[PDB]
């Protein structure tokens, strides 16, 4: 509260570390469904159904231009990618399996880096 602060957790490496994690996700073999925005003119249903589209290129641009205020807003966008994937794709499809694999991969790197 006013004039009463918890000790300062060091955040000065967060930008660099989220960049490294994102590089590892970009280069995973199962990243292909997630590298670019879904083409809303060509994929029926996507526009109306998925209220907040997100993809790795969009996260990389946001990261590069100071649009994440902290590491939690970064994690929120990454999880949005996989949450959208589960909403639109059956678990037993190549893209559905890709999404589960990528979420698992992400969440381990996240815990190992920060927790």
Q: Is 31 exposed, middle or buried (0-12, 13-18, 19+ CB in 10 A)?
A: middle
Kind plus residue range of the DSSP H or E element containing 42: none
Non-local CB neighbours of 18 within 8 Å, separated by 6+ positions: 63, 68, 71, 74
User: Taking a C-beta distance cutoff of 8 angstroms, is the pair 38, 50 a contact?
Assistant: yes
To the nearest 10°, the Cα dihedral for 20, 23, 27, 32? 140
Cα distance between residue 44 and residue 50, in whole Å: 11
CA distances from 41 to 37, 48, 54 (A): 11, 12, 16
CATH of domain 1-115: 1.20.920.10
Q: How far apart are CA 85 and CA 69, in angstroms?
A: 25
């Amino acid at each position: 509260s006013m004039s009463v602060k918890k000790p300062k957790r060091d955040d000065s490496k967060d930008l660099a570390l989220c960049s490294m994690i994102l590089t590892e996700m970009e280069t995973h073999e199962d990243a292909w469904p997630f590298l670019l925005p879904v083409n809303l003119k060509l994929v029926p249903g996507y526009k109306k159904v998925i209220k907040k589209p997100m993809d790795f290129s969009t996260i990389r641009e946001k990261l590069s231009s100071g649009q994440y205020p902290n590491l939690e807003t970064f994690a929120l966008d990454v999880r949005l990618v996989f949450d959208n994937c589960e909403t639109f794709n059956e678990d037993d499809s190549d893209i559905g399996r890709a999404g589960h694999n990528m979420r698992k991969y992400f969440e381990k790197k996240w815990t190992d880096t920060f927790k």
